Curated annotation (Swiss-Prot):
Keyword S-adenosyl-L-methionine recorded: yes
Annotated positions binding [4Fe-4S] cluster: C62, C66, C69
InterPro entries on file: Aldolase_TIM, BATS_dom, Elp3/MiaA/NifB-like_rSAM, FeFe-hyd_HydE_rSAM, HydE/PylB-like, rSAM
Species in which this protein is naturally found: Thermotoga maritima (strain ATCC 43589 / DSM 3109 / JCM 10099 / NBRC 100826 / MSB8)
Alphabetical GO biological process terms: sulfur compound biosynthetic process; water-soluble vitamin biosynthetic process
Name this polypeptide is given: [FeFe] hydrogenase maturase subunit HydE
Cofactors: [4Fe-4S] cluster; [2Fe-2S] cluster
Amino acid sequence: TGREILEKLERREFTREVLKEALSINDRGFNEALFKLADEIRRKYVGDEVHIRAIIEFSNVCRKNCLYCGLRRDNKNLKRYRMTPEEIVERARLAVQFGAKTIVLQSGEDPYXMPDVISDIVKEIKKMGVAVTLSLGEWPREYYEKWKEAGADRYLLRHETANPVLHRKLRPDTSFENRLNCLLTLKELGYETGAGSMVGLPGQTIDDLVDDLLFLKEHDFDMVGIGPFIPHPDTPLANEKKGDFTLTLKMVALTRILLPDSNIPATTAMGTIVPGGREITLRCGANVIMPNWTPSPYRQLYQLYPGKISVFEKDTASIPSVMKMIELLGRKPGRDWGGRKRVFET
Ligand SMILES: C[C@H](CCC(=O)NCCC[N+](C)(C)CCCS(=O)(=O)[O-])[C@H]1CC[C@H]2[C@@H]3[C@H](O)C[C@@H]4C[C@H](O)CC[C@]4(C)[C@H]3C[C@H](O)[C@]12C
Ligand SMILES: C[C@H](CCC(=O)NCCC[N+](C)(C)CCCS(=O)(=O)[O-])[C@H]1CC[C@H]2[C@@H]3[C@H](O)C[C@@H]4C[C@H](O)CC[C@]4(C)[C@H]3C[C@H](O)[C@]12C
Ligand SMILES: Nc1ncnc2c1ncn2[C@@H]1O[C@H](C[Se]C[C@H](N)C(=O)O)[C@@H](O)[C@H]1O
Ligand code: MET
Ligand code: SF4
Ligand SMILES: [Cl-]
Ligand SMILES: [Cl-]
């Protein structure tokens, strides 16, 4: 019954059958209790601080062709852009002036920058006394090594799906094995490492979602980014169903229960499929928010999926808006870089 699943989650009996049953029960009472449990674990382990990561999406050029993504190379109905190094550095400086304590640099897999222009940008931003997170895709070990020597602190590389068959179908340039090898290299090089997955991919099953949770737990990732699949009209998956908000929220809540000391964002995709979805997610296990800091006129050209919020407002609105959010939630802004603070247990 739901009570018995909750009890097993509370005593840390994280078996495959317990996770499947949590994801399969659709009862409102059960779901609300699950969300309350995750919220309480979050508060006890990571407290009330919500860490702000300012994201600059500096290029929408990509060499890969992932079937879900609006930036895929085969999409000709997109104006491509690249920010200059100076633009990136100065836009980072503006975010630090606005109180950001981590800068995230994200792009398509755009060969132009790689590896040396990224290194040069990283060194300049590190002088500002903030954490730097990279989210640039799959590259050789040597590139990751260079970026770590340049001063990068963290790397986000969602595993997308832990089903190797599904992974290869959706990401035909590469494989799950390659994705995992990148994540293991990043861990070995001393990055704080983020993984995570989409929920509601075409062909993805409940057992696949269980395998995503067990994967995350196995590798003890420092950050876990989860959101729904949202179909993009200029992709092969244009006519597929969007991922379910509630199911995706349950994946966030279980991630917190499994990895109680991790850093878990309330992703912009969650706020795209449901109005107020980030705020809900911050009350169901999440403790990080990533306001968009990409400048106009580029911001509106980086749409992995459609409907992305934060496009019509001034490009400096997002940091103040998340600071208001944090206050109205009865939470506090992060006081330091918000690195992982491990609580060793049994
Ligand atoms: C805000 C709404 C509706 C509350 C409501 O409107 N309930 C009636 C009035 C109650 N009051 C005490 C204000 C007055 C009672 C006297 S009265 O005379 O009105 O009957 C309630 C109903 C269900 C609640 C969520 C669930 O828990 C799951 C989850 C637990 C986490 O931990 C925090 C996040 C989350 C999503 C919760 C948020 C919020 O909390 C919800 C939406
Ligand atoms: C950038 C400009 C010009 C001056 C400047 O270049 N200022 C650098 C500050 C650098 N820090 C953020 C590291 C200071 C931390 C001080 S603190 O005492 O908060 O630790 C300054 C002048 C007024 C400042 C805003 C207001 O204040 C209100 C508000 C406070 C929140 O809090 C952060 C967000 C917000 C919107 C502020 C953003 C930014 O900052 C503004 C625009
Ligand atoms: N089509 C679509 N739907 C949702 N999520 C997508 C899609 N394409 C790519 N992605 C995901 O974005 C991450 C990068 Se971080 C995303 C932000 N946190 C956000 O929510 O906007 C990719 O790794 C992929 O999972
Ligand atoms: C824009 S998608 C996120 C960054 C990188 N292209 C990746 O797929 O991991
Ligand atoms: S998900 Fe990342 S690698 Fe794949 S097409 Fe989009 S931008 Fe390129
Ligand atoms: Cl980060
Ligand atoms: Cl993320």
